[PDB]
Design a binder for these strands. Structure first.
Ligand SMILES: [Mg+2]
Ligand SMILES: [Mg+2]
Ligand SMILES: [Mg+2]
Ligand SMILES: [Mg+2]
Ligand SMILES: [Mg+2]
Ligand SMILES: [Mg+2]
Lengths: 63, 64
DNA sequence: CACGCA
RNA sequence: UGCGUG
């Protein structure tokens, strides 16, 4: 669902931008009110686009 | 489902015993005619039980 | 692409 | 428990 996926990417970027430091998936699932698998589908697509990076397992930062 | 799981463990053991060597999961899925996920739930339980060993990624041998 | 994960 | 896997 692209409209949902767009909202998810929006929020991920907002939260990573406001954090200025690595953020765990556990926080992201709470911030996006979304199942972990749906967030991870978006995160790893953004990872291939070089928008976010994995600093450590299930921990994300702004690319 | 314990009846299904029992038969699946039976078939896994038959395949690994007859091979005399490590068997890939892809083989086991064809031999058992079961989805990969349900084979893996049984295989990793049998590994904890020391009935089979994981000799390399997704490759299985009889015995602990 | 290994993945079994409840 | 990292899991995204189509
Ligand atoms: Mg909107
Ligand atoms: Mg029977
Ligand atoms: Mg790998
Ligand atoms: Mg379990
Ligand atoms: Mg691990
Ligand atoms: Mg893909």
């Amino acid at each position: 669902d692209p409209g949902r996926e767009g909202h998810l990417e929006q929020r991920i970027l907002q939260v990573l931008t406001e954090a200025g430091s690595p953020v765990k998936l556990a926080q992201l699932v709470k911030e996006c009110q979304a199942p972990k698998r749906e967030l991870n589908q978006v995160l790893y697509r953004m990872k291939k686009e070089l928008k976010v990076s994995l600093t450590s397992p299930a921990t994300w930062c702004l690319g």
